[PDB]
Amino acid sequence: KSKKGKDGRFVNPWPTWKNPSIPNVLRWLIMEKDHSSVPSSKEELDKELPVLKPYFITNPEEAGVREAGLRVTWLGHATVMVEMDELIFLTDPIFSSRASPSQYMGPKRFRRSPCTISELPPIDAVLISHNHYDHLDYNSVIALNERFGNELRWFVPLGLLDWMQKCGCENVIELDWWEENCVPGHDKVTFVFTPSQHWCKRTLMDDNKVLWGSWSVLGPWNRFFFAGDTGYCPAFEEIGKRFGPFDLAAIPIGAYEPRWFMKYQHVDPEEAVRIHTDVQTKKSMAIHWGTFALANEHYLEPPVKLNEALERYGLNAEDFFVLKHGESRYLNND
Amino acid sequence: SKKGKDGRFVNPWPTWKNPSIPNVLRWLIMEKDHSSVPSSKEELDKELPVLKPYFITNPEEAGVREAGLRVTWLGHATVMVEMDELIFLTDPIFSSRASPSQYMGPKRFRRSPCTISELPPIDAVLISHNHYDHLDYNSVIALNERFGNELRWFVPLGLLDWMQKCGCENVIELDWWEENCVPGHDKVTFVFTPSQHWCKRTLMDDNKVLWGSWSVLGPWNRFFFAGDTGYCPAFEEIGKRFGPFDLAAIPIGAYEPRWFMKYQHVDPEEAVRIHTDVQTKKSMAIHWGTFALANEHYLEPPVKLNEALERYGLNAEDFFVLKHGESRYLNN
Numbered sequence A: 001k002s003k004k005g006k007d008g009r010f011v012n013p014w015p016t017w018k019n020p021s022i023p024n025v026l027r028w029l030i031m032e033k034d035h036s037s038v039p040s041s042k043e044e045l046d047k048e049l050p051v052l053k054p055y056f057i058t059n060p061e062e063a064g065v066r067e068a069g070l071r072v073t074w075l076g077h078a079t080v081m082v083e084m085d086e087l088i089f090l091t092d093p094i095f096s097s098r099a100s101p102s103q104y105m106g107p108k109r110f111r112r113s114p115c116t117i118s119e120l121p122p123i124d125a126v127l128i129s130h131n132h133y134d135h136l137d138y139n140s141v142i143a144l145n146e147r148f149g150n151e152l153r154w155f156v157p158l159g160l161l162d163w164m165q166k167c168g169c170e171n172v173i174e175l176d177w178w179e180e181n182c183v184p185g186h187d188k189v190t191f192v193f194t195p196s197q198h199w200c201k202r203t204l205m206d207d208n209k210v211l212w213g214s215w216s217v218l219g220p221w222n223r224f225f226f227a228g229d230t231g232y233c234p235a236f237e238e239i240g241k242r243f244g245p246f247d248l249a250a251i252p253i254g255a256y257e258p259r260w261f262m263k264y265q266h267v268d269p270e271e272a273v274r275i276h277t278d279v280q281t282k283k284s285m286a287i288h289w290g291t292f293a294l295a296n297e298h299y300l301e302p303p304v305k306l307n308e309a310l311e312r313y314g315l316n317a318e319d320f321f322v323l324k325h326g327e328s329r330y331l332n333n334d
Numbered sequence B: 001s002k003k004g005k006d007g008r009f010v011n012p013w014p015t016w017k018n019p020s021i022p023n024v025l026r027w028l029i030m031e032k033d034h035s036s037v038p039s040s041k042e043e044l045d046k047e048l049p050v051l052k053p054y055f056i057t058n059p060e061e062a063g064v065r066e067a068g069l070r071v072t073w074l075g076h077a078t079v080m081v082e083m084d085e086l087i088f089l090t091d092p093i094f095s096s097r098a099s100p101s102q103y104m105g106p107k108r109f110r111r112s113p114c115t116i117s118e119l120p121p122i123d124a125v126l127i128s129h130n131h132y133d134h135l136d137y138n139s140v141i142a143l144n145e146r147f148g149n150e151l152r153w154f155v156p157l158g159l160l161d162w163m164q165k166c167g168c169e170n171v172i173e174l175d176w177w178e179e180n181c182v183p184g185h186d187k188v189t190f191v192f193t194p195s196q197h198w199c200k201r202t203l204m205d206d207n208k209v210l211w212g213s214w215s216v217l218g219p220w221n222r223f224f225f226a227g228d229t230g231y232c233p234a235f236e237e238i239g240k241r242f243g244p245f246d247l248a249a250i251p252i253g254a255y256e257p258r259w260f261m262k263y264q265h266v267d268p269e270e271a272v273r274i275h276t277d278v279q280t281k282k283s284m285a286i287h288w289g290t291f292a293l294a295n296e297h298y299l300e301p302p303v304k305l306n307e308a309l310e311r312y313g314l315n316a317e318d319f320f321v322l323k324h325g326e327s328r329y330l331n332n
């Protein structure tokens, strides 16, 4: 322990130790989402954003990794299924149509989930970046703990242990910044909770009662990063130094409109490539975007801006790629 | 005329039927005890396989026109019927949970055979009553969003406000024994007909809106849809005014325990009794298999229906149960 940014707790709750943060939010009702991307008749969306059928549906076998490499599947938004070092773990699972506490108001995904809970292979762990309704889905937790359970190791930030138990999960681990743990079975892999510049909120006045963050999974064979939700911040340089080089990093590239406002909690594609450089990863996956309209940008804009920023930094789509809904990708290491 | 209409108690709608008795006491702490226990995904694939509808692989097989009659079961009471230049949906529920909340309520154990975007052009939807497993807010939004005036909403008395607040302009409030039609081709008639059930969505809105059943009289085929009901008269009356019918969709589920349910939910024997009363050639067996709204085994209703069919001198052909997503072309 020499020079890591730690928490990061004001009076009772946690602010971001990062300097760029400014405290002023006015939340989500009808206001900035509105319709400035204008998703048209679904056939348009099928052409632009085709939802694929994941490999583990047609071929339920083959869903391991056979050590060596690293397989990844994008299940919309921040839902990512990662297979490595004899483990298959999900990240920020959202399978409901609506990311909201109500059934009558809230952002409803314009792209259906590539698969269902019953159809996915045996999960060994779930990673929760923060507690927002588009990353933490009550019904999804219910489904996973109904099919899985005790066998499902939930890795959550500080403050969500109570919530997880109230949902009905027994194998739950609260982690603080730079804290680590593992799956009981496979001790060779370590799951570390690492900083991020975001916030937490589900109800009134519980703002930041629970922590946010990012996850670093250190296997013997593969190293993986998952940013979650964040604006640009110096803690990703710290992550790239302490850990790294990583094999895959999942970086949000969406919901970066009113930068003047979002920039403190949401990178844009330029800042996303900035993250990719910071974390010292070999490859990066474009998560967020494409699933929910959580900001004002055109729903196809973030990939275009990502390619522009990639060219800016002298990189190619190979280094930082965007998948289709349900598409998979295998990556074998040196 | 003999037609038994009704009614208007000193405040809400009665059933006016003799058998009605006090039997409500909402199911939030009532028979929650789930003793049918659907589980074991292996059990669900074998027991209740969800089929993939024809209009998925061949969306153009919209059928209809052919003088006959096609039906597709999309779980619970959600049924798509195509005949006599019409494709109309009935009691559409596509959400997982039939509840006003996202945290409590009956979550279907058999997911919907298809989604809203995948179905062919629907010309009409029929709403039997306002319960959360027959009237689904999100489904209504979806259809009036993909569709608009291109949707004939037929609702009981008291539901016009709800539908307009949802955003539908093509809505018709009916009192049972009243008729109407779809603008384009008026040759087909939609009639709201009696039934023995109740209505409730919130606190103190008990029976503010009517329940009932639907009779669709085309030039070529006549079709009945019961909706939700316990056994009561007027099914003979329905068989009298119109009929003989070609198809009837009769609920066969959510009947146990009997002492509580008999007055608003038929059992399969009473379903066969309805089949006889209404004068239909064939029957489709709706409700059941999708949501657990009672204590009976989730597989029991088909067995009890076949037992009652043998009982009443009828064959499985006369009263058939489809699989989830299966279709059937009842011609002639």
Ligand SMILES: C[C@H](CCC(=O)O)[C@H]1CC[C@H]2[C@@H]3CC[C@@H]4C[C@H](O)CC[C@]4(C)[C@H]3C[C@H](O)[C@]12C
Residues within 6 Å of the ligand: A026, A027, A028, A029, A204
């Ligand atoms: C706009 C209405 C009331 C209108 C009025 O009477 O003026 C108000 C009353 C309830 C308010 C919500 C309460 C919960 C939230 C509190 C946040 O700190 C701001 C966003 C939310 C989601 C609020 C949004 C909005 O400010 C609402 C919906």
Ligand SMILES: C[C@H](CCC(=O)O)[C@H]1CC[C@H]2[C@@H]3CC[C@@H]4C[C@H](O)CC[C@]4(C)[C@H]3C[C@H](O)[C@]12C
Residues within 6 Å of the ligand: none
């Ligand atoms: C659902 C009831 C009324 C039902 C009825 O009496 O028929 C209405 C009455 C007051 C309504 C709220 C008033 C403040 C807000 C107004 C916004 O424009 C939409 C969100 C809110 C938070 C509304 C949500 C909801 O639409 C409420 C709670």
Ligand SMILES: C[C@H](CCC(=O)O)[C@H]1CC[C@H]2[C@@H]3CC[C@@H]4C[C@H](O)CC[C@]4(C)[C@H]3C[C@H](O)[C@]12C
Residues within 6 Å of the ligand: A101, A102, A104, B100, B137, B201, B202
């Ligand atoms: C009970 C009706 C729906 C009735 C129906 O569909 O017939 C629903 C519709 C809108 C819902 C409200 C929306 C705003 C609020 C959302 C909160 O997360 C819970 C409390 C409130 C005040 C909700 C209470 C209740 O859940 C309402 C009023």
Ligand SMILES: C[C@H](CCC(=O)O)[C@H]1CC[C@H]2[C@@H]3CC[C@@H]4C[C@H](O)CC[C@]4(C)[C@H]3C[C@H](O)[C@]12C
Residues within 6 Å of the ligand: A138, A162, A163, A166, A167, B103, B104
């Ligand atoms: C009330 C139901 C269960 C009711 C039943 O037995 O049918 C319970 C089951 C799980 C419960 C939730 C667990 C997670 C959350 C814990 C919070 O500290 C309060 C809100 C939430 C969202 C809870 C709300 C509510 O208390 C729920 C949904």
Ligand SMILES: C[C@H](CCC(=O)O)[C@H]1CC[C@H]2[C@@H]3CC[C@@H]4C[C@H](O)CC[C@]4(C)[C@H]3C[C@H](O)[C@]12C
Residues within 6 Å of the ligand: A203, A204, A205, A206
């Ligand atoms: C009104 C009851 C009961 C009062 C009590 O237990 O003393 C209280 C108990 C718990 C309260 C809820 C807990 C979860 C949420 C906490 C938020 O910070 C504000 C909104 C919510 C949704 C609260 C709204 C409401 O105020 C509740 C439901």
Ligand SMILES: C[C@H](CCC(=O)O)[C@H]1CC[C@H]2[C@@H]3CC[C@@H]4C[C@H](O)CC[C@]4(C)[C@H]3C[C@H](O)[C@]12C
Residues within 6 Å of the ligand: B025, B026, B027, B028, B029
């Ligand atoms: C049992 C609790 C209260 C617990 C206590 O006694 O402290 C009570 C409080 C409010 C009650 C609900 C009120 C609305 C409904 C009234 C019906 O007649 C039965 C079902 C419902 C949905 C009730 C279910 C249950 O009877 C609840 C949830």
Ligand SMILES: C[C@H](CCC(=O)O)[C@H]1CC[C@H]2[C@@H]3CC[C@@H]4C[C@H](O)CC[C@]4(C)[C@H]3C[C@H](O)[C@]12C
Residues within 6 Å of the ligand: none
């Ligand atoms: C989610 C809040 C608060 C949780 C917390 O902050 O600790 C809890 C506290 C009070 C809870 C309610 C108490 C009465 C009811 C009890 C029933 O068995 C389930 C539904 C109801 C309506 C409960 C729903 C939910 O479980 C509530 C609203």
Ligand SMILES: C[C@H](CCC(=O)O)[C@H]1CC[C@H]2[C@@H]3CC[C@@H]4C[C@H](O)CC[C@]4(C)[C@H]3C[C@H](O)[C@]12C
Residues within 6 Å of the ligand: A101, A138, A202, A203, B100, B101, B103
């Ligand atoms: C706002 C939290 C969700 C918090 C979370 O998801 O973490 C949810 C969880 C349980 C929800 C309650 C369930 C019972 C009631 C359902 C009604 O139709 C609206 C009012 C009540 C009292 C609900 C209010 C609100 O919708 C609650 C309290």
Ligand SMILES: C[C@H](CCC(=O)O)[C@H]1CC[C@H]2[C@@H]3CC[C@@H]4C[C@H](O)CC[C@]4(C)[C@H]3C[C@H](O)[C@]12C
Residues within 6 Å of the ligand: A029, A030, A104, A105, B137, B161, B162, B165, B166
């Ligand atoms: C409050 C939102 C819309 C808010 C917005 O436009 O941003 C509105 C939009 C549609 C509204 C619903 C329409 C159908 C119902 C009408 C009832 O008489 C009251 C409950 C319901 C379920 C309404 C609840 C609430 O009033 C909703 C959900």
Ligand SMILES: C[C@H](CCC(=O)O)[C@H]1CC[C@H]2[C@@H]3CC[C@@H]4C[C@H](O)CC[C@]4(C)[C@H]3C[C@H](O)[C@]12C
Residues within 6 Å of the ligand: B202, B203, B204
């Ligand atoms: C707090 C407002 C008062 C505003 C008004 O006078 O309209 C009241 C009056 C109208 C109320 C709604 C009317 C329809 C529903 C009646 C239910 O039995 C409880 C939930 C609902 C959804 C109510 C929630 C809430 O109790 C509201 C929104």
Ligand SMILES: O=S(=O)(O)c1cc(S(=O)(=O)O)c2cc(S(=O)(=O)O)ccc2c1
Residues within 6 Å of the ligand: A095, A096, A097, A098, A115, A116, A117, A118, A139, A140, A143, B094, B095, B096, B097, B111, B138
């Ligand atoms: O568990 S799943 O089989 O993966 C699952 C879970 C939910 S739910 O989380 O919201 O209950 C779903 C909700 C919808 S809907 O359009 O919003 O009604 C559709 C499909 C779903 C599939």
Ligand SMILES: [Zn+2]
Residues within 6 Å of the ligand: A130, A132, A198, A229
């Ligand atoms: Zn967020």
Ligand SMILES: [Zn+2]
Residues within 6 Å of the ligand: A132, A134, A135, A229, A255, A288, A294
């Ligand atoms: Zn987000």
Ligand SMILES: [Zn+2]
Residues within 6 Å of the ligand: B129, B131, B197, B228
């Ligand atoms: Zn009913």
Ligand SMILES: [Zn+2]
Residues within 6 Å of the ligand: B131, B133, B134, B228, B287, B293
């Ligand atoms: Zn029903």
